[PDB]
Amino acid sequence: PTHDVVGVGFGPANLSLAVALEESPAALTSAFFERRASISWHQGMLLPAAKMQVSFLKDLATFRNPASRFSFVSFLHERGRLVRFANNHDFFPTRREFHDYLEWAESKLAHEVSYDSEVTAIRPGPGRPVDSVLVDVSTPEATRTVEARNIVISTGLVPRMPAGVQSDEFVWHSSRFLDHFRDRDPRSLRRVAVAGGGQSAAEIVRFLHDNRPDTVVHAIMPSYGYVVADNTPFANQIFDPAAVDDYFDGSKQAKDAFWRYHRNTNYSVVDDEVIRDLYRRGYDDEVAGAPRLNFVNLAHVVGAKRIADDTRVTVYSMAREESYDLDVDVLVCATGYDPMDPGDLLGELAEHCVQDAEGRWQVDRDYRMVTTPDLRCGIYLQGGTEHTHGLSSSLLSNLATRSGEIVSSIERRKS
Amino acid sequence: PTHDVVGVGFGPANLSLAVALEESPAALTSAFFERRASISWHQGMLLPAAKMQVSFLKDLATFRNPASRFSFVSFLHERGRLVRFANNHDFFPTRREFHDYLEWAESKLAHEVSYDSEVTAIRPGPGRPVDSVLVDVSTPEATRTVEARNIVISTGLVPRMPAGVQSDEFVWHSSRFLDHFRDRDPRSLRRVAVAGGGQSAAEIVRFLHDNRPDTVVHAIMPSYGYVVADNTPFANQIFDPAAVDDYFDGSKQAKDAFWRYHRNTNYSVVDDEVIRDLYRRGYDDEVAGAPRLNFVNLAHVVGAKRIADDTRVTVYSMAREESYDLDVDVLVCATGYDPMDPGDLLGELAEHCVQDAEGRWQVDRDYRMVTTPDLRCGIYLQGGTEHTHGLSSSLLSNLATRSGEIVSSIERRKS
Amino acid sequence: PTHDVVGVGFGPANLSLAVALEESPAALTSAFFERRASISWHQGMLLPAAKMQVSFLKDLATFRNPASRFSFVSFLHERGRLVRFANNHDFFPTRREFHDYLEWAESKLAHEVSYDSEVTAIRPGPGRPVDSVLVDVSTPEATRTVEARNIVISTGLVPRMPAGVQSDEFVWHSSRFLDHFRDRDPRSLRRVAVAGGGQSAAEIVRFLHDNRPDTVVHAIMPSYGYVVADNTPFANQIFDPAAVDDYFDGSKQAKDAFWRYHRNTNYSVVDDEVIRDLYRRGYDDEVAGAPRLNFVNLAHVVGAKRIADDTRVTVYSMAREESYDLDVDVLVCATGYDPMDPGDLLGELAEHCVQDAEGRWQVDRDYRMVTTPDLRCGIYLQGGTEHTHGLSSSLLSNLATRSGEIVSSIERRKS
Amino acid sequence: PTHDVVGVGFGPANLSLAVALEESPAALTSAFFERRASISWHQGMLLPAAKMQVSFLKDLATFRNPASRFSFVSFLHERGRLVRFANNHDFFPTRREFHDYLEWAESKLAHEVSYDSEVTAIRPGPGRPVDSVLVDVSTPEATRTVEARNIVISTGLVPRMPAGVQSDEFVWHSSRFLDHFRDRDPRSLRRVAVAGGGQSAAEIVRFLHDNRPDTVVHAIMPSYGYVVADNTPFANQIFDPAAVDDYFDGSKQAKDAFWRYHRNTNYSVVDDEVIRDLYRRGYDDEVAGAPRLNFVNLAHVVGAKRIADDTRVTVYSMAREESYDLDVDVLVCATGYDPMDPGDLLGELAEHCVQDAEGRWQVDRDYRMVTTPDLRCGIYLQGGTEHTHGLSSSLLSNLATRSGEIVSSIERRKS
Numbered sequence A, B, C, D: 001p002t003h004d005v006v007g008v009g010f011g012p013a014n015l016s017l018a019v020a021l022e023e024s025p026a027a028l029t030s031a032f033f034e035r036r037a038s039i040s041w042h043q044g045m046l047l048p049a050a051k052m053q054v055s056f057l058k059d060l061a062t063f064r065n066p067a068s069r070f071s072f073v074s075f076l077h078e079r080g081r082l083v084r085f086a087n088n089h090d091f092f093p094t095r096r097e098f099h100d101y102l103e104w105a106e107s108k109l110a111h112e113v114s115y116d117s118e119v120t121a122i123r124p125g126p127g128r129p130v131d132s133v134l135v136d137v138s139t140p141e142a143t144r145t146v147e148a149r150n151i152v153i154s155t156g157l158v159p160r161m162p163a164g165v166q167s168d169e170f171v172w173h174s175s176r177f178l179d180h181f182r183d184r185d186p187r188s189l190r191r192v193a194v195a196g197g198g199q200s201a202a203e204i205v206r207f208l209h210d211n212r213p214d215t216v217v218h219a220i221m222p223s224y225g226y227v228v229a230d231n232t233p234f235a236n237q238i239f240d241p242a243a244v245d246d247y248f249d250g251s252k253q254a255k256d257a258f259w260r261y262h263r264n265t266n267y268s269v270v271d272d273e274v275i276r277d278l279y280r281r282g283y284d285d286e287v288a289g290a291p292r293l294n295f296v297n298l299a300h301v302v303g304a305k306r307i308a309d310d311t312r313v314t315v316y317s318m319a320r321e322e323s324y325d326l327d328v329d330v331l332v333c334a335t336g337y338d339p340m341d342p343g344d345l346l347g348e349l350a351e352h353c354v355q356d357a358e359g360r361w362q363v364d365r366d367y368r369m370v371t372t373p374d375l376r377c378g379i380y381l382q383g384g385t386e387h388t389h390g391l392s393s394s395l396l397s398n399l400a401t402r403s404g405e406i407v408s409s410i411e412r413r414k415s
């Protein structure tokens, strides 16, 4: 049994693909594999009060199909919360509600996802040219192989730690913050250092401040203060479906301009309201004569070592150009992520995938990796296209249109 | 040919009824009559900057059917503006855009509306008990009569002038502001009085201030200053579909409490931003030493007379308890509207419509007028239910649910 | 030793009087008596997130003297927080900070206030006509009497419980909320009813929701939901110094109009942001499937009785026109306050003090009670002038100008 | 007659210096010279709706002296606008009002500024080492020379045109926009190109859109859309008086970090509200089917030539890496400014001013240029210290503290 398409990973990106597949009139067979027990959308960072960074209109389907049974509006309606949500007049749902939306959409799907199923490798199918790939899936009980004419790799962002710092029992990456935090005794985390100046760092520091009245926090970041995230309407157009075209068709010079001017729409920046909330908290503590939030600006965490009852953090101060040590109980590195990279999963197939000048994967407008003639099977990327398709690649901005384009590309080829 | 339902008027209320009819699986015959040449949704007040007072989610259908082909979102999508609209992050479309939405929905409708067709009377059909009504329709060429088992009266708010003031060449009701304004020579309206403290008064004054840099405006209103319209989330729940039940089932005492506490969600109040824009304009004029906006507070317009080249407005000052005259070129009365009242149109049938203690029409939960057993045909009201169904009656808050309930009531009773 | 002026009470009103006395070139002797150990500005309601309802520019002096050493800006500067405060761009300080401001201003004052000094009575001085009053002061150790040519009564709002409900160990007025709350064991207040729909009720409910994750709260109020407080710029002008004149000189009819249109600037209303915060909290609980906030709308608390371990609250539902019982651990009545009334302290002196039609005290424009010719001593009111001077009377809106006018009145009469 | 200090230029910077001189107990003699007839604070850009980019608390004195007779608050109070301004609850005055504040402060000053007086050169006074400077002043009638022991150069930002583009009758710099615009027939500017993506470009485009209904505007800028200006509270701390020390004492690496992370607090960015106003305008034009605003993104103006009745603008498109021509009536270059540079005015004295590695003037913490021992006279810079003191140098953020520090430095040295 050869599938038209196999999806690796089941986050929002492949969920929207499943939705696109179901809504399409095209009869395409598919299978999806997720290594976790169920949809798990950055649960380590499901902090109380966490808000979506994207308007509810940018959901699984709406921009493609304005009357989808899988829209956020349909979800709210079924949950009997549409009226309540509309009364709020807020475009940005909480992360908790969006996580629900995903699970609700997944249940509504006809298809059935295979969970606890980790893709361990992707191999050339039989024959030359290669017309299919073999997908090696490992479950808790067994291992198996599925064959598909196309594969969509959507395995998500990859946590990045500071250079010279490794995760450990007392050094966590923000992506695992709640995993570790719920285990430890509250009275054992009285001193926390959080490295970073982005949304994760801000959200974690705010949470620590709100969670216990006596926690002391050291917010260590390279900027002089949090930088506001830009989602004003003109800059925000870089996330438009049509902006994918502008970026893709644009010269390298134009692509560089997008990053140079609008990186602050997503990377190393913090939502306005979270910034203001943090500033108010700091101010009130001052008024109360009980400061707890220590902002260590113009600085980088450069090392961590466990010394007895202390996690000893080495901090480099740019202002003085010298490093020094800071003792805390835990170091949380909210130091961001690297883009998805299909390389590892691809193995041997990588030989047939064409790279650019800077040694990155060449990808077509329809999200299909460029391959030599030796490979005829479609390898599509949802994620890992920052350099070809632009800043929407790792985000929720363009799920509906990308998934629709991928489905269309596959139908166009099959036939 | 007897219709299941005839709609009198084709504003948003009956348009949503048409949409509900089309989306219903029920096979119901219908005809709609609109006196005007086309949909004309308060065009007299289609001022340049005018905004909807209601979230775009409160459209023709969405609260009832979250995936309607007639939703505002579908409209934006077809107009290729959904992405642009989402970039704005504003729940409130302009009135211009919403007017378009109505015309777009009307065109999409399978049904064909009869324009230039004014319903002049509604009469008892043949037989006892009366099982149908006869609808007298006057067109420019002819007159005709159609028969229907049910009728939905949705003829809209009725302009209300101040007591002792009649409309004329130089005394306009706000509803006909742009009609008159476009005709006159700009250099002829250097002095305008606008009576009222509500949304219409504020929008007209702002427009006059923005339109020509020399116009002098007298804003005459009973309050000490504009009162803000309340649409904060808890108060705003009075517009919920479920709040219709609370109001309807509640005692007279509870109904009175809705008006006593939440009248300021809609009547005699002004949108926050329009208030602030007016205040900033007044302020800047002061800075410039060139005041143009004269706020005449704690006052009522009590009369108007034309004396030569002046419209002489009699103003009563509450503070001084005396009246005085103000000469301007034009008096605009933005003094509001009375609720729709089916009475006049009903003629003979009214005898069989049951009234309450205070002399108002009794109406059932499904919007159907209470009649004696002499009348078995359905008379439904969209509008004119302020006293039975509450503050959403004249508004766009609840189009989707009301139209759906009316259609359901009719299907139920057909059987 | 006869003082020119004696102040009864030492809240913001008399503090601003002391400031006005010190800034005045007039050499006036004075004494101030406060019954508490120190300035105590609604400490029972000093909740964690509580914000001023008035801009920082409306402080002790600024509207009168734009370069006062006692301004909020001077205070921030001295406290080395001016720059930090300005970075916030928020006109509204926290209540905690403002309480500090009062203390700071009081310390700066040359004059020494007499604390732990309760004024128990005010009596006629000697002579005919009466040219001074005798002020009976009770301290913990002794009692004494001081003599003054003028007296300024500023003893503040008086808590008002619902009719038929008395304060008790388990029935508290909001004004004493933190007093009682700090004593009780947290695990003993799992069920709280809060009566009222105003700022106090909303702040208390928000605090209870934020303070412990498992407290269940019943918010019982007559409206269908919180009504927003209006401070949009035109309505806000009722608080202008010049608006005192408009209200004072205006007919009774005009005075009624201020209340009829603008009572929502202060009474039975809630700040926009606090409303939205509460709505978001309720929403998130619903998403989490763990509702804790129970809004009991269109209702009044009409009785309370303690039965065993339960406080039994009798609630009257307007919708059903029937009462019923609700069992909680504590009932908090956030049911507001009555205006200051000088009647009580005045005792015998009432006889020389003139009343109006509705039987209230007549007061001159300079805040001086109207007396017969037999009394020539000045009795001034800061508070209790709602009916003569308008809505600014109990508020902080007009401290600077009123205090300045009282001082001027006193200097004028001396001469 | 030798002055303690001579100020070159009389904008806000030297105006705040004069105020600091007057408030200081130090007896210092001074003279100020302004080339223009009066204070002229970017009048070329005094567009109708233009707002301050800085809180009113950052005025001529307040951060230094919280009770200055020259504060913005004092100004509002004298102008009987303080109450009105406070009702607005907006920290940002209009530019028109601020211009008024400057002139009001200037009039209140005891000192008399010398207008129509252009400093043409600064020369070494007699003797070695040089203890004074000679200041050559040119008036319309005469020329003269004054002698001073210190000089403060505050001559303002210098307009910068694009490389390869010169100003002319039809190519204007934004600084002279209104000068030219109020000298041309409205019906003659139907087509305007505005180069730039900063605050000036945005305001000019908005103004053109609002000013006439039929003007067509080409907004040409290198970014993909306007980038929002950051003034959220933590990033905004770079403007704190104390942040001057952090920047000054910090390593070059730290100074670079300020620019790398927080350039977007001022340069090449647009105020949030102006961005949104432009987006709403573009949207409504689209709805109306009458587009007028043409956004030419990822582009630079690289040349301009007059050809008959057309101004021919050469545009370079980064996306296509090619240039093309655009014909309009006028090209407005809102392409920014260069920092003040004392070099030209200094002439011979420059030999003795010490430069850094990158060829820029060394400046001490007290704003005094570093000189060799050959020069003992003080040369202070208000402006031109971006590289030593940071981003507040050309701004209004820190007038009060800088002027106070300069006065102090001068008193100290005279000592």
Ligand SMILES: Cc1cc2c(cc1C)N(C[C@H](O)[C@H](O)[C@H](O)COP(=O)(O)OP(=O)(O)OC[C@H]1O[C@@H](n3cnc4c(N)ncnc43)[C@H](O)[C@@H]1O)c1[nH]c(=O)[nH]c(=O)c1N2
Pocket: A008, A009, A010, A011, A012, A013, A014, A015, A033, A034, A035, A036, A039, A040, A041, A042, A045, A051, A052, A053, A054, A117, A118, A119, A120, A154, A155, A156, A157, A382, A383, A394, A395, A396, A397
């Ligand atoms: C805390 C936080 C919060 C947000 C965001 C990021 C972060 C860190 N994002 C960006 C984020 O990337 C986006 O929300 C989605 O997670 C991306 O969808 P994907 O389906 O592509 O990856 P995603 O990371 O969601 O899913 C990948 C899945 O594949 C699985 N997987 C990995 N390897 C596998 C293998 N070998 N075999 C099988 N399964 C495998 C993973 O387990 C995972 O379930 C975001 N963006 C935005 O626009 N708005 C927002 O609000 C947010 N919110």
Ligand SMILES: Cc1cc2c(cc1C)N(C[C@H](O)[C@H](O)[C@H](O)COP(=O)(O)OP(=O)(O)OC[C@H]1O[C@@H](n3cnc4c(N)ncnc43)[C@H](O)[C@@H]1O)c1[nH]c(=O)[nH]c(=O)c1N2
Pocket: B008, B009, B010, B011, B012, B013, B014, B033, B034, B035, B036, B039, B040, B041, B042, B045, B051, B052, B053, B054, B117, B118, B119, B120, B154, B155, B156, B157, B382, B383, B394, B395, B396, B397
């Ligand atoms: C200026 C302005 C702006 C708004 C609003 C009011 C006003 C005055 N409203 C309220 C307004 O009532 C609502 O927008 C609808 O117009 C009500 O729908 P009907 O369809 O009920 O009225 P209308 O929309 O008033 O429907 C009446 C139609 O029937 C026709 N008609 C009447 N008698 C007839 C006859 N005998 N024969 C044939 N045709 C006849 C009329 O010509 C008219 O076209 C509003 N509410 C809200 O919630 N949000 C908002 O943004 C606004 N905006």
Ligand SMILES: Cc1cc2c(cc1C)N(C[C@H](O)[C@H](O)[C@H](O)COP(=O)(O)OP(=O)(O)OC[C@H]1O[C@@H](n3cnc4c(N)ncnc43)[C@H](O)[C@@H]1O)c1[nH]c(=O)[nH]c(=O)c1N2
Pocket: C008, C009, C010, C011, C012, C013, C014, C015, C033, C034, C035, C036, C039, C040, C041, C042, C045, C051, C052, C053, C054, C117, C118, C119, C120, C154, C155, C156, C157, C382, C383, C394, C395, C396, C397
């Ligand atoms: C919780 C809360 C919060 C606010 C407000 C009210 C409440 C309940 N208010 C209104 C409030 O009335 C105002 O802030 C001041 O408290 C009023 O100033 P007074 O000096 O007149 O009375 P205030 O009540 O402040 O002081 C009266 C004093 O006299 C003392 N006293 C009474 N009898 C005495 C006696 N016989 N002898 C000696 N001393 C006696 C009392 O002990 C007390 O200290 C307000 N308004 C506003 O405009 N902005 C705001 O932010 C707030 N905030």
Ligand SMILES: Cc1cc2c(cc1C)N(C[C@H](O)[C@H](O)[C@H](O)COP(=O)(O)OP(=O)(O)OC[C@H]1O[C@@H](n3cnc4c(N)ncnc43)[C@H](O)[C@@H]1O)c1[nH]c(=O)[nH]c(=O)c1N2
Pocket: D008, D009, D010, D011, D012, D013, D014, D015, D033, D034, D035, D036, D039, D040, D041, D042, D045, D051, D052, D053, D054, D117, D118, D119, D120, D154, D155, D156, D157, D382, D383, D394, D395, D396, D397
């Ligand atoms: C359109 C616009 C609007 C703003 C701003 C800039 C621009 C371009 N700015 C920044 C601006 O630089 C600041 O507002 C002041 O103008 C700086 O004050 P200065 O006194 O240093 O120079 P400024 O440019 O104000 O004045 C210098 C004066 O010296 C005169 N002069 C020059 N050479 C001379 C000579 N040889 N002899 C005699 N006189 C001479 C000039 O005539 C001029 O009057 C700003 N920043 C901010 O923080 N908030 C804001 O809102 C704004 N607003």
Ligand SMILES: NC(=O)c1ccc[n+]([C@@H]2O[C@H](COP(=O)([O-])OP(=O)(O)OC[C@H]3O[C@@H](n4cnc5c(N)ncnc54)[C@H](OP(=O)(O)O)[C@@H]3O)[C@@H](O)[C@H]2O)c1
Pocket: A045, A050, A051, A052, A053, A095, A162, A163, A174, A195, A196, A197, A198, A199, A200, A201, A203, A220, A221, A222, A266, A267, A268, A269, A299, A300, A301, A302, A334, A335, A336, A337
């Ligand atoms: N509520 C939500 O929906 C939510 C919450 C969290 C995250 N997200 C999303 O997830 C994505 C990632 O954001 P992120 O905050 O996780 O990471 P990020 O945006 O990449 O930012 C990481 C931060 O760490 C800093 N950093 C890196 N190395 C450091 C070091 N050695 N010492 C100190 N600081 C260091 C970075 O500074 P430099 O940039 O200068 O290197 C940057 O400030 C974004 O799309 C974000 O919006 C969303």
Ligand SMILES: NC(=O)c1ccc[n+]([C@@H]2O[C@H](COP(=O)([O-])OP(=O)(O)OC[C@H]3O[C@@H](n4cnc5c(N)ncnc54)[C@H](OP(=O)(O)O)[C@@H]3O)[C@@H](O)[C@H]2O)c1
Pocket: B045, B050, B051, B052, B053, B095, B162, B163, B174, B195, B196, B197, B198, B199, B200, B201, B203, B220, B221, B222, B223, B266, B267, B268, B269, B299, B300, B301, B302, B334, B335, B336, B337
């Ligand atoms: N952009 C939009 O979508 C838009 C625009 C305009 C209107 N609307 C809607 O239309 C409906 C009605 O609004 P409206 O503003 O037209 O009417 P309105 O809300 O009833 O306002 C009427 C006003 O005129 C006053 N008034 C009455 N008689 C007067 C007199 N003799 N002299 C001076 N003033 C007098 C009223 O005072 P009193 O209240 O004290 O009696 C009140 O201030 C509302 O639902 C509104 O939201 C919407």
Ligand SMILES: NC(=O)c1ccc[n+]([C@@H]2O[C@H](COP(=O)([O-])OP(=O)(O)OC[C@H]3O[C@@H](n4cnc5c(N)ncnc54)[C@H](OP(=O)(O)O)[C@@H]3O)[C@@H](O)[C@H]2O)c1
Pocket: C045, C050, C051, C052, C053, C095, C162, C163, C174, C195, C196, C197, C198, C199, C200, C201, C203, C220, C221, C222, C223, C266, C267, C268, C269, C299, C300, C301, C302, C334, C335, C336, C337
């Ligand atoms: N952060 C702050 O600075 C702050 C905090 C709290 C209060 N304040 C100020 O203090 C003043 C008073 O505010 P407030 O909230 O204490 O009192 P309030 O404004 O007088 O409100 C009292 C509320 O209780 C309701 N009520 C009365 N009797 C009731 C009953 N038997 N059962 C249920 N509800 C009942 C009232 O309803 P009805 O209107 O229908 O009578 C009203 O909603 C205001 O000036 C306010 O701004 C300021």
Ligand SMILES: NCCC[C@H](N)C(=O)O
Pocket: A053, A054, A055, A058, A230, A231, A236, A239, A265, A266, A395, A396, A397, A398
């Ligand atoms: N970090 C998420 C950015 C989302 C973007 N503003 C968008 O509207 O798609």
Ligand SMILES: NCCC[C@H](N)C(=O)O
Pocket: C053, C054, C055, C058, C230, C231, C236, C239, C265, C266, C395, C396, C397, C398
């Ligand atoms: N609840 C106090 C209201 C204060 C009023 N808005 C003022 O500006 O004075």
Ligand SMILES: NCCC[C@H](N)C(=O)O
Pocket: D053, D054, D055, D058, D230, D231, D236, D239, D265, D266, D395, D396, D397
């Ligand atoms: N472009 C002017 C920026 C001013 C700065 N945000 C400040 O508050 O000082």
Ligand SMILES: [K+]
Pocket: A106, A107, A108, A109, A110, A111, A112, A113
């Ligand atoms: K499923």
Ligand SMILES: [K+]
Pocket: C021, C022, C023, C024, C025, C026, C027, C028
């Ligand atoms: K004095």
Ligand SMILES: [K+]
Pocket: D021, D022, D023, D024, D025, D026, D027, D028
């Ligand atoms: K001096």
Ligand SMILES: [K+]
Pocket: D106, D107, D108, D109, D110, D111, D112, D113
């Ligand atoms: K002067």
Ligand SMILES: [K+]
Pocket: D107, D108, D109, D110, D111
């Ligand atoms: K002078």
